[PDB]
Design a protein around this nucleic acid. Sequence first.
RNA 1: UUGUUUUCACUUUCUCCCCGCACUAAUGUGGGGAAAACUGGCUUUAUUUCUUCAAUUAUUUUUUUUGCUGAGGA
RNA 2: UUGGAUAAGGUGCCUAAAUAUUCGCUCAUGAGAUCCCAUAAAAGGUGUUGGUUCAUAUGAACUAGCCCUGAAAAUGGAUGGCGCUAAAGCGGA
Lengths: 147, 185, 35, 201, 180, 103, 128
Amino acid sequence: VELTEEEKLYISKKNLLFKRFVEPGRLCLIEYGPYAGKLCFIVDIVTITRVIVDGAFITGVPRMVIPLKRLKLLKERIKINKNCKSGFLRKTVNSTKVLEEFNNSKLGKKMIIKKKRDEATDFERFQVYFAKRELKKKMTTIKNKKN
Amino acid sequence: KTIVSTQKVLIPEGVKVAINARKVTVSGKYGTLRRSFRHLPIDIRLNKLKKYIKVVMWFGVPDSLACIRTVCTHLKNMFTGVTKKFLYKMRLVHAHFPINSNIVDNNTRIEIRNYLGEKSVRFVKALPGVVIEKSPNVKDEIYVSGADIENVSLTAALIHQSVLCRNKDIRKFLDGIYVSEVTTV
Amino acid sequence: KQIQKKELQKINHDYYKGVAKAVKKKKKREEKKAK
Amino acid sequence: MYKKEYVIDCKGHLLGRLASLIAKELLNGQRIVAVRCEDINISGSLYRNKLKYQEFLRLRTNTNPKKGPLHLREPSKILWRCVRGMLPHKTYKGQLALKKLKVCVGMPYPYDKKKKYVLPSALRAFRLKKHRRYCRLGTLSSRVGWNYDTLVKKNEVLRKQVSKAYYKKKVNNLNEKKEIKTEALNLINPEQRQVLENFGY
Amino acid sequence: IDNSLNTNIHQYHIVGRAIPTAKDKNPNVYRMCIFAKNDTNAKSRFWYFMKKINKLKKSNGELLACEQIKERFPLRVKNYGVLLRYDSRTGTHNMYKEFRDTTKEGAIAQLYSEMAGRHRARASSINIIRISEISSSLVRRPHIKQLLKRRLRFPALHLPTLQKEYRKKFASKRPSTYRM
Amino acid sequence: LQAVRLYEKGVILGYKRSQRNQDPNFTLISIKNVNTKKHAQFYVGKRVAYVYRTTKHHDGVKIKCIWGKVCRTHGNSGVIRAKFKTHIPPKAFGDRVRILMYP
Amino acid sequence: KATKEMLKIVEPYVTYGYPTLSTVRKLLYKRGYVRVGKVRRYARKKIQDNADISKHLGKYNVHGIEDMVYQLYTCGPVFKKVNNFLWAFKLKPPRKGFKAKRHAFNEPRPGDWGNREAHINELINRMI
RNA sequence: UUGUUUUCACUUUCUCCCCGCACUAAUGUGGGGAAAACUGGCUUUAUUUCUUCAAUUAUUUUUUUUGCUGAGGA
RNA sequence: UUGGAUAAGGUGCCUAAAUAUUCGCUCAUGAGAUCCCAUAAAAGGUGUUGGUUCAUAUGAACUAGCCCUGAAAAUGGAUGGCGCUAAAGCGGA
């Protein structure tokens, strides 16, 4: 009744064209409207074009209806129930640490560094300029030693 | 607009199938066929170790859903044409003037003469992967065979349509070359 | 305001029930005239 | 808009949308150079667009066709005429805007070695539902009387080979520079390294 | 709250009554649920139906109540069956349509958009009779039926809708509609 | 290197305008990196310099500036209206202005 | 009854509604001009002071713009005199525009003319 | 000739069992049953800076950055 | 006259303002596209999209949206032009 050893490799290597579905618990990023740039979880689906997204009390997005075209689905998804509420969604988000593993992917790090780079003050902008200047000095030194 | 609709096709025994971005290559003991379905929004899944191909359509309206079965039938036609070559048996019927068929360039390029005693040569060139030969059992027969059903059937149609009658009662002047039957080898 | 909330719930419940009973009466009349 | 010149790879764009964007840029004063005009797309079937061009061809001053609408068959000239129709070309400012535009088939010598830009609000991939018909401007031009399609195609394959060689050299140089940088990151003072690491450098 | 997203349909409960005359000491009072942009339009519709159904006009009537009905659970999606009467260019037809969303007013807004889109029926040609929540086992339209599977999931084939700020004119490489 | 800029580049589009009617009291200006009304509201009240060259000297210099100021936004896509001391000539349509950082 | 029947014949070309106290006060305080002079020689003047209100309406004890506001808001004993003393308000165009002056406020499509009921307050605020 | 009262039918499972037993869009699935109760709903207590305190309206009070204007001369 | 804010009408370019948002419909080998206004009918369609009423998910019969046929004229030609089909078309919001 089980699958022995064929499953553990064939299912994994299946490599479906479509991952990242619109199931409940899908972690998506809003990209249009007043909540653009914030993360949220699909909690359930009302129509093909409409969904309910709830950012748990972390991300700052309230539980609300949003058209699906305003979302960008991410890789991460939690196993929240069909009809779960905000409190259990927060509990599950914290337990799974899904937000942490998003702020580790290439997109999450890009967003984080972009945030702090645009938050940088004038002095630390100069500090970056100075540091890159020093790095360029060293890079030229070792490039010439390479020859 | 249905959310998801799928159809499954079974892969026969001696067939190798490679599908990449709905470009399909089917290889078998009668050669290799290729076919691109990039004109259709289709999610094609090929299961290699357990055979079968599933074509799935998300958010299909009836007009687009009509093409799922079309693609599946095309795939199964590639399978059968690669396992057992498609064969169109054609009969050349004639009333008073026998039709002289001559097959040249390695069972392509069939040329017929004496169509209604016209003493003018009408020749047709077979499509790629198609051979035309005379049947060994019944004399007024012609075999148009090959691995690709589109090419084979088009060659049969070309032979039929190259020999149409003009300026006569078509329902009395019945002579011509007609597809008698369709089968495989 | 718990008592006011209860009275409020009761009046809206009665309004919804009246609407639903109108629904049922019209459906019953339509089924009567179907035959 | 604020560059000296914008080179636009016209491959895969829709003709009217591309022309509208180019026209606005030229009027605002930006010089643009449109390359690969033979790969422009038009929505609607090839036969339908061929009928449109036949209707255009049937149009001439019957007293003297030399004065008539000059028809022009190169896809680059077709794009140029579309942009001019999206432009106030009979004024002095409109004429300047029109003459700030350069159109090419393929990618000639200066423009094959510069960055090519793309307009997202005019790609077919973003503006046409896949189940709808479109045509290729080079094919339409060839059916209408251009007969330089195949030559442009072979020039393009030669250019692509040269570009691939250039890209291989560039990728190797980028890897070498990355390795030099990552070695040098351990030779700078820890405060500078910390700042760069914090801000993503 | 996103005003780019909200529609301006609300449900109003309106109670009215003919002015008591010497003929009848107290006329029977009527109540109705009307979907309208505001309470003023709701009252106008209420008097329109008063006059059309009963022989009672605004000038001989008076308004006992008019209050907005708020949905109990505006974040719980439910299925609505709405009965409908509308006159086309050549006749009058009553139909029945199904939606699913969080509020009755939202379902009615969907109904208005769809009737305009499918039948070119202006809002002045539509009369809403009997919108009511239905059970999943009694849903009849297939486009709603397919929304009520045990686990419902699909890809996200929509094209990205970025902000104006990042909707930049010149791109450096061709974007992907595949994104995902 | 030298010649710090500390100003935002802009381009002189036409006048404040309707179809077939002009109001050359305001000039429509496009600013370099602004594409939204909210972002364009940022540079409101800033001084604008239309600096241009001249065929012959006028105070020993070949350069003169028409001074103006950003007054409000125009439309939804980060175009602003600027009021200058004197109406900038239509020959300057498409030329460069400096949205200065002061006041 | 008389003014309602007069308003009926002008309904397609106006929009009206019930003002509320804050909007009455705003109208009088920031757009309130008054007919000052001799009878039939009135000379529109912004209020700016209670002297002229006292001079014309004082015999009905209406010394003051707050008395004016009260009598207008609550249709009190001195309404005809206060309303006639007050010059017709000259309002600005609405800040966000109209919807369509062609169509009724009560039409299902966007429209403006007719009785707006309480919705006159937001329009007045945009027009003030 | 209105109310009132009653019956079942309504939920999640990353649970168990059976059949197809790998058949799915699926890292699962279709059909038929059992289970509690995580999920969801309700009640009691304490709390609202863990988190929520919304929206609309009435009634009030401020605030960021800023454009244009300066009649008169008691 | 200087500012402000609007009407009618518009916001892809010509052309100031949305290649806005949101939901449907439409593929036209002579699509369609702002009152007056710059023509189109009877009659048809197994194009597609919704509704209605009968038939043990099947077959019918109706209905009405958009599309198609019906639809031929003389200089070369006009939704104003370019063009537009994930609309820049049609009906809404």
